[PDB]
Amino acid sequence: NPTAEEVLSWSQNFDKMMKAPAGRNLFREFLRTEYSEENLLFWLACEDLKKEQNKKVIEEKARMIYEDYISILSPKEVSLDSRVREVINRNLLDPNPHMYEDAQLQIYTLMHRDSFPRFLNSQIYKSFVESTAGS
Ligand SMILES: [Ca+2]
Ligand SMILES: [Ca+2]
């Protein structure tokens, strides 16, 4: 169960927050307030895919990820460099569970550099810290 001090410690360590299930859930709540939650949803989907070996499951999950977050027509599309997308598009024709690893790192970095600082300045972050303090 995350304490006030744990929630506060995340302000100096994005990696620590992202390792914590509560860190990811609290961050997600914030991201939805600024309509950038697709980045984290994609990141989580990629984490889940990496744990699969069954070919049908890999195919179905890889294609779902593409359709939800990669296709230029998806409403939950994430922002990726053209070289990353090119390699994804080739891999889509023969899916493997590591095919989103580069895109995952790109989106992690985006979250770290762009939305994370805004999280730390948000009233919702203040309220998270204060909701777990026993004062
Ligand atoms: Ca959005
Ligand atoms: Ca396999």
Coordinates of N, CA and C and ligand atoms in Angstrom, one line a residue:
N1 N 0.9 -1.2 0.0 CA 0.0 0.0 0.0 C 0.9 1.2 0.0
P2 N 0.7 2.1 -1.0 CA 1.6 3.3 -1.1 C 1.4 4.4 -0.1
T3 N 2.5 4.7 0.7 CA 2.4 5.8 1.6 C 2.6 7.2 1.0
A4 N 2.4 8.2 1.8 CA 2.6 9.6 1.3 C 4.0 9.8 0.8
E5 N 5.0 9.3 1.6 CA 6.4 9.4 1.3 C 6.8 8.7 0.0
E6 N 6.2 7.5 -0.3 CA 6.4 6.8 -1.5 C 5.8 7.6 -2.7
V7 N 4.6 8.1 -2.6 CA 4.0 8.9 -3.7 C 4.9 10.2 -3.9
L8 N 5.4 10.8 -2.9 CA 6.3 12.0 -3.0 C 7.6 11.6 -3.6
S9 N 8.2 10.4 -3.3 CA 9.5 10.0 -3.9 C 9.5 9.9 -5.4
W10 N 8.3 9.6 -5.9 CA 8.1 9.5 -7.4 C 8.5 10.8 -8.1
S11 N 8.3 11.9 -7.5 CA 8.7 13.2 -8.1 C 10.2 13.3 -8.5
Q12 N 11.1 12.5 -7.8 CA 12.5 12.5 -8.2 C 12.9 11.2 -9.0
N13 N 11.9 10.4 -9.4 CA 12.2 9.1 -10.0 C 11.1 8.5 -10.8
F14 N 11.0 8.8 -12.0 CA 10.0 8.3 -12.9 C 10.0 6.8 -13.0
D15 N 11.2 6.2 -13.1 CA 11.4 4.8 -13.2 C 10.7 4.1 -12.0
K16 N 11.0 4.6 -10.8 CA 10.4 4.1 -9.5 C 8.9 4.1 -9.6
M17 N 8.3 5.2 -10.0 CA 6.8 5.3 -10.2 C 6.3 4.2 -11.2
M18 N 7.0 4.1 -12.3 CA 6.6 3.2 -13.4 C 6.7 1.7 -13.0
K19 N 7.6 1.4 -12.0 CA 7.7 0.0 -11.5 C 6.6 -0.3 -10.5
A20 N 6.0 0.7 -9.9 CA 4.9 0.5 -8.9 C 3.5 0.4 -9.6
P21 N 2.8 -0.7 -9.3 CA 1.4 -0.7 -9.9 C 0.6 0.5 -9.5
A22 N 0.7 1.0 -8.3 CA -0.1 2.2 -7.9 C 0.4 3.4 -8.6
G23 N 1.7 3.5 -8.9 CA 2.3 4.6 -9.6 C 1.7 4.7 -11.0
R24 N 1.6 3.5 -11.7 CA 1.0 3.5 -13.0 C -0.5 3.8 -13.0
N25 N -1.2 3.4 -12.0 CA -2.6 3.6 -11.9 C -2.9 5.1 -11.6
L26 N -2.1 5.7 -10.8 CA -2.3 7.2 -10.4 C -1.9 8.0 -11.6
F27 N -0.8 7.7 -12.3 CA -0.3 8.4 -13.5 C -1.4 8.3 -14.5
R28 N -2.0 7.2 -14.8 CA -3.1 7.0 -15.8 C -4.2 7.9 -15.5
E29 N -4.7 8.0 -14.2 CA -5.8 8.9 -13.9 C -5.4 10.3 -14.3
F30 N -4.2 10.8 -14.0 CA -3.8 12.1 -14.5 C -3.8 12.2 -16.0
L31 N -3.2 11.2 -16.7 CA -3.1 11.4 -18.1 C -4.4 11.5 -18.8
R32 N -5.4 10.8 -18.3 CA -6.8 11.0 -18.9 C -7.3 12.4 -18.7
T33 N -6.9 13.1 -17.7 CA -7.4 14.5 -17.5 C -6.8 15.4 -18.5
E34 N -5.7 15.1 -19.1 CA -5.1 15.8 -20.2 C -5.1 15.1 -21.6
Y35 N -5.9 14.0 -21.6 CA -6.2 13.3 -22.9 C -4.9 12.7 -23.5
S36 N -4.0 12.3 -22.7 CA -2.8 11.6 -23.3 C -2.6 10.2 -22.7
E37 N -3.7 9.6 -22.2 CA -3.6 8.3 -21.6 C -3.3 7.2 -22.6
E38 N -3.6 7.4 -23.9 CA -3.2 6.4 -24.9 C -1.7 6.0 -24.8
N39 N -0.8 6.9 -24.4 CA 0.6 6.6 -24.3 C 0.8 5.5 -23.3
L40 N 0.2 5.6 -22.1 CA 0.3 4.6 -21.1 C -0.4 3.3 -21.4
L41 N -1.6 3.4 -22.0 CA -2.4 2.2 -22.4 C -1.6 1.4 -23.4
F42 N -1.0 2.1 -24.4 CA -0.1 1.4 -25.3 C 1.1 0.8 -24.6
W43 N 1.8 1.5 -23.7 CA 2.9 1.0 -23.0 C 2.6 -0.3 -22.2
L44 N 1.4 -0.2 -21.6 CA 1.0 -1.4 -20.8 C 0.7 -2.6 -21.7
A45 N 0.0 -2.3 -22.9 CA -0.3 -3.4 -23.8 C 1.0 -4.0 -24.3
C46 N 2.0 -3.2 -24.6 CA 3.3 -3.7 -25.0 C 4.0 -4.6 -23.9
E47 N 3.9 -4.2 -22.7 CA 4.4 -5.0 -21.5 C 3.7 -6.4 -21.5
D48 N 2.4 -6.4 -21.7 CA 1.7 -7.6 -21.7 C 2.0 -8.5 -22.9
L49 N 2.2 -8.0 -24.1 CA 2.6 -8.8 -25.2 C 3.9 -9.5 -25.1
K50 N 4.9 -8.8 -24.5 CA 6.2 -9.4 -24.3 C 6.3 -10.7 -23.5
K51 N 5.2 -10.9 -22.7 CA 5.1 -12.1 -21.9 C 4.5 -13.3 -22.6
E52 N 4.1 -13.2 -23.9 CA 3.4 -14.3 -24.6 C 4.3 -15.0 -25.5
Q53 N 4.1 -16.3 -25.6 CA 4.7 -17.2 -26.6 C 3.8 -17.9 -27.5
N54 N 2.5 -18.0 -27.2 CA 1.5 -18.7 -28.1 C 1.3 -17.8 -29.3
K55 N 1.5 -18.5 -30.5 CA 1.5 -17.7 -31.8 C 0.1 -17.0 -32.0
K56 N -1.0 -17.7 -31.8 CA -2.3 -17.1 -32.0 C -2.5 -15.9 -31.1
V57 N -2.1 -16.0 -29.8 CA -2.2 -14.9 -28.8 C -1.3 -13.7 -29.3
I58 N -0.1 -14.0 -29.7 CA 0.8 -13.0 -30.2 C 0.2 -12.3 -31.4
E59 N -0.3 -13.0 -32.4 CA -1.0 -12.5 -33.6 C -2.1 -11.5 -33.2
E60 N -3.0 -12.0 -32.3 CA -4.2 -11.3 -32.0 C -3.9 -10.1 -31.2
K61 N -3.0 -10.2 -30.2 CA -2.6 -9.0 -29.4 C -1.8 -8.0 -30.1
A62 N -0.9 -8.5 -31.0 CA -0.1 -7.6 -31.8 C -0.9 -6.8 -32.8
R63 N -1.9 -7.5 -33.4 CA -2.8 -6.8 -34.3 C -3.8 -5.8 -33.6
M64 N -4.2 -6.2 -32.4 CA -5.0 -5.3 -31.6 C -4.3 -4.0 -31.2
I65 N -3.0 -4.2 -30.8 CA -2.2 -3.1 -30.5 C -2.0 -2.2 -31.7
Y66 N -1.8 -2.8 -32.9 CA -1.7 -2.0 -34.1 C -2.9 -1.2 -34.4
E67 N -4.1 -1.9 -34.3 CA -5.3 -1.3 -34.6 C -5.8 -0.2 -33.6
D68 N -5.4 -0.4 -32.4 CA -5.7 0.6 -31.4 C -4.8 1.8 -31.3
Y69 N -3.5 1.6 -31.5 CA -2.5 2.6 -31.1 C -1.5 3.0 -32.2
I70 N -1.4 2.2 -33.3 CA -0.4 2.4 -34.4 C -1.0 3.0 -35.6
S71 N -2.1 2.4 -36.1 CA -2.7 2.8 -37.4 C -2.9 4.3 -37.3
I72 N -2.6 5.0 -38.4 CA -2.9 6.4 -38.5 C -4.3 6.8 -38.4
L73 N -5.2 5.8 -38.6 CA -6.7 6.1 -38.4 C -7.2 5.8 -37.0
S74 N -6.4 5.2 -36.1 CA -6.9 4.9 -34.8 C -7.1 6.2 -33.9
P75 N -8.3 6.3 -33.2 CA -8.4 7.4 -32.3 C -7.4 7.4 -31.1
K76 N -6.9 6.2 -30.7 CA -5.9 6.1 -29.6 C -4.4 6.0 -30.2
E77 N -4.2 6.5 -31.4 CA -2.9 6.5 -32.0 C -1.9 7.2 -31.1
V78 N -0.7 6.6 -31.0 CA 0.5 7.2 -30.3 C 1.5 7.7 -31.4
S79 N 2.2 8.7 -30.9 CA 3.1 9.5 -31.8 C 4.5 8.7 -31.9
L80 N 4.9 8.2 -33.1 CA 6.1 7.5 -33.3 C 6.9 8.0 -34.5
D81 N 8.2 7.9 -34.4 CA 9.1 8.2 -35.5 C 8.8 7.3 -36.7
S82 N 9.1 7.8 -37.9 CA 8.7 7.1 -39.1 C 9.5 5.7 -39.3
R83 N 10.7 5.7 -38.8 CA 11.6 4.5 -38.9 C 11.0 3.4 -38.0
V84 N 10.6 3.8 -36.8 CA 10.0 2.9 -35.9 C 8.7 2.3 -36.5
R85 N 7.9 3.1 -37.1 CA 6.6 2.7 -37.7 C 6.9 1.8 -38.9
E86 N 7.9 2.1 -39.7 CA 8.2 1.3 -40.8 C 8.5 -0.2 -40.4
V87 N 9.3 -0.3 -39.4 CA 9.7 -1.7 -38.9 C 8.5 -2.4 -38.3
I88 N 7.7 -1.7 -37.6 CA 6.4 -2.2 -37.1 C 5.5 -2.8 -38.2
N89 N 5.4 -2.0 -39.3 CA 4.5 -2.4 -40.4 C 5.0 -3.7 -41.0
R90 N 6.3 -3.8 -41.2 CA 6.8 -5.1 -41.7 C 6.6 -6.2 -40.8
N91 N 6.8 -6.0 -39.5 CA 6.6 -7.0 -38.4 C 5.1 -7.4 -38.3
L92 N 4.2 -6.5 -38.6 CA 2.7 -6.8 -38.5 C 2.3 -8.0 -39.4
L93 N 3.1 -8.2 -40.5 CA 2.8 -9.3 -41.4 C 3.3 -10.6 -40.9
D94 N 4.2 -10.6 -39.9 CA 4.7 -11.8 -39.2 C 5.0 -11.5 -37.7
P95 N 4.0 -11.3 -36.9 CA 4.1 -10.8 -35.6 C 5.0 -11.6 -34.6
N96 N 5.8 -10.9 -33.8 CA 6.6 -11.5 -32.7 C 6.4 -10.7 -31.5
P97 N 6.6 -11.3 -30.3 CA 6.3 -10.6 -29.1 C 7.2 -9.4 -28.7
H98 N 8.3 -9.3 -29.4 CA 9.2 -8.1 -29.1 C 9.1 -7.0 -30.1
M99 N 8.1 -7.1 -31.0 CA 8.0 -6.1 -32.2 C 7.7 -4.7 -31.8
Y100 N 7.2 -4.4 -30.6 CA 6.9 -3.1 -30.1 C 7.9 -2.5 -29.1
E101 N 9.1 -3.2 -28.9 CA 10.0 -2.8 -27.9 C 10.6 -1.4 -28.2
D102 N 11.0 -1.1 -29.4 CA 11.5 0.2 -29.8 C 10.4 1.3 -29.6
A103 N 9.2 1.0 -30.0 CA 8.1 2.0 -29.9 C 7.8 2.2 -28.4
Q104 N 7.8 1.1 -27.6 CA 7.6 1.2 -26.2 C 8.6 2.2 -25.5
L105 N 9.9 2.0 -25.8 CA 10.9 2.9 -25.3 C 10.7 4.4 -25.7
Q106 N 10.3 4.6 -26.9 CA 10.0 5.9 -27.4 C 8.8 6.6 -26.6
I107 N 7.8 5.8 -26.4 CA 6.6 6.3 -25.7 C 6.9 6.5 -24.2
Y108 N 7.7 5.6 -23.6 CA 8.2 5.7 -22.2 C 8.9 7.1 -22.0
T109 N 9.8 7.3 -23.0 CA 10.6 8.6 -23.0 C 9.7 9.8 -23.1
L110 N 8.7 9.7 -24.0 CA 7.7 10.8 -24.2 C 7.0 11.1 -22.9
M111 N 6.5 10.0 -22.2 CA 5.8 10.2 -21.0 C 6.7 10.8 -19.9
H112 N 8.0 10.3 -19.8 CA 9.0 10.8 -18.9 C 9.3 12.3 -19.1
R113 N 9.4 12.7 -20.3 CA 9.9 14.1 -20.6 C 8.7 15.1 -20.7
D114 N 7.5 14.7 -21.2 CA 6.4 15.6 -21.5 C 5.3 15.6 -20.4
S115 N 4.6 14.5 -20.2 CA 3.5 14.5 -19.3 C 3.9 14.4 -17.9
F116 N 4.9 13.7 -17.5 CA 5.3 13.5 -16.1 C 5.6 14.8 -15.4
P117 N 6.3 15.7 -16.0 CA 6.5 17.0 -15.3 C 5.1 17.7 -15.0
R118 N 4.2 17.6 -15.9 CA 2.8 18.2 -15.7 C 2.1 17.5 -14.6
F119 N 2.2 16.2 -14.5 CA 1.6 15.4 -13.4 C 2.1 16.0 -12.1
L120 N 3.4 16.2 -11.9 CA 3.9 16.7 -10.6 C 3.5 18.1 -10.3
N121 N 3.0 18.9 -11.2 CA 2.5 20.2 -11.0 C 1.0 20.3 -10.9
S122 N 0.3 19.1 -10.9 CA -1.2 19.0 -11.0 C -1.8 19.0 -9.6
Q123 N -3.0 19.5 -9.5 CA -3.8 19.4 -8.3 C -4.1 18.0 -7.9
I124 N -4.2 17.1 -9.0 CA -4.6 15.7 -8.7 C -3.4 15.0 -8.0
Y125 N -2.2 15.3 -8.4 CA -1.0 14.8 -7.7 C -0.9 15.2 -6.2
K126 N -1.2 16.5 -5.9 CA -1.3 17.0 -4.6 C -2.3 16.2 -3.8
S127 N -3.5 16.0 -4.4 CA -4.6 15.3 -3.7 C -4.3 13.8 -3.5
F128 N -3.6 13.2 -4.4 CA -3.1 11.8 -4.2 C -2.2 11.7 -3.0
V129 N -1.2 12.6 -2.9 CA -0.3 12.6 -1.7 C -1.1 12.8 -0.4
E130 N -2.0 13.8 -0.4 CA -2.8 14.2 0.7 C -3.8 13.1 1.1
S131 N -4.3 12.4 0.2 CA -5.3 11.3 0.4 C -4.7 10.1 1.2
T132 N -3.4 9.9 1.2 CA -2.8 8.8 1.9 C -2.0 9.2 3.1
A133 N -1.9 10.5 3.4 CA -1.3 11.0 4.6 C -2.3 10.8 5.8
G134 N -1.8 10.3 6.9 CA -2.6 10.0 8.1 C -2.6 11.2 9.1
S135 N -1.8 12.2 8.8 CA -1.6 13.4 9.6 C -2.4 13.5 10.9
Ligands
CA1 CA -5.5 11.5 -26.7
CA2 CA 5.8 -19.2 -30.1

